[PDB]
Design a protein around this ligand. Structure first.
Ligand code: 3BC
Ligand code: ZN
Ligand code: ZN
Lengths: 181, 21, 16, 151
């Protein structure tokens, strides 16, 4: 089976603001990647091995709204640009890659999986360059190897006059390290 | 600062399926 | 006659 | 929900269609020059290519277009009309070998279907099953390029 994905909006602006302030979200959770939002920006969080990871430059040091109130971060690594909370009850976790593949696939917030060629521990080139506008909102999303295993989390794009030619990611390795710190 | 709130989901575990009627 | 569509497949397995 | 793959049928047979780049493509040996039904009447083919066993109508309602592959991978996946996925390794620009041969029946009715890459992008359109004594060991397919050039 090839990599396919679909997205579902679970809540709207106003319901999002209320939940943000209250910290109590009773909605049912499903999926490996959650579309996440703050009152200032929206991005993605990826559940890998029981932990819901995301990009520090999006979540900052905030708590995640849950059905039992706000949940404090499990890991915060300003340097690795990582933060992680216990994966919400109901989400499914990805498992780290163990095949050293150089053919990666990026999953965007619009549930599109675009191929990227690994060209370093943190960079991979888009086989088909796309407008930066396409990647907006996808930071924290996953980069899977052909087996559908976590290779890294999208962190920033390498834009050239508005077109994304490559991407910077946080390889799974930095996660284990962040957990050991 | 408030809490990060989930507003959607992306499911990868889905497989081809004949849409019901 | 025509070719009629008798069903459809969603590759992502999207329920919705 | 919207489907990329339409299960279609003519008085004689049943096969599949795949929407790519806004067109609903299928095999000429299934549809011929037939028009596709629509609640506002039959809509004629935009592209008919007998030479390539390729035809196409404007993508119907309840459909969503599939993305052409751009990763070159040879690890293809065929989707049958029963929604089954069959890993097919690429042996050439228009042919591939099933990693596990299945009786020809398993692939019966799936022509027009898509051959996806590891990213779920269209690599080609399933043209015909290559079977030896009723065992499909390989498949013939119309690569996306043909679709792309026909447009
Ligand atoms: C991620 O946080 C974004 C994704 C990226 C494609 C645009 N990443 C970043 O913003 C990172 C981040 C800072 C700089 N980033 C970059 O991507 C920049 N490039 C860069 O640093 O390149 C190097 C130097 C080569 C590595 C760039 C392209 C110049 C901006 C750091 C590295 C720390 C993300 O998707 N953010 C969420 C977001 O965009 N949200 C908005 C939103 O909700 N707003 C604005 C209200 C949004 C969401 C959906 C659609 C549109 C906007
Ligand atoms: Zn792997
Ligand atoms: Zn591909």
């Amino acid at each position: 089976a090839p990599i396919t994905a679909y997205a579902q909006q679970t809540r709207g602006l106003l319901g999002c603001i209320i939940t943000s302030l209250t910290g109590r979200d009773k909605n049912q959770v499903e999926g490996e990647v959650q579309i996440v939002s703050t009152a200032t920006q929206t991005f993605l969080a990826t559940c890998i091995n029981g932990v819901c990871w995301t990009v520090y430059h999006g979540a900052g040091t905030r708590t995640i709204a849950s059905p039992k109130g706000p949940v404090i971060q499990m890991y915060t690594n300003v340097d690795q640009d990582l933060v992680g909370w216990p994966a919400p009850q109901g989400s499914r976790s990805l498992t780290p890659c163990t095949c050293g593949s150089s053919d990666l696939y990026l999953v965007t917030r619009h549930a599109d999986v675009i191929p990227v060629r690994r060209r370093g521990d943190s960079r991979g080139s888009l086989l088909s360059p796309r407008p930066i506008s396409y990647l907006k909102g996808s930071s924290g999303g996953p980069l899977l190897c052909p087996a559908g295993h976590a290779v890294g989390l999208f962190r920033a794009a390498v834009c050239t006059r508005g077109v994304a030619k490559a991407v910077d990611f946080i390889p799974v390795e930095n996660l284990e390290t962040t957990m050991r710190s | 600062k408030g809490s990060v709130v989930i507003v959607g989901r992306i499911v990868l575990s889905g497989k081809p399926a004949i849409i019901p009627k």
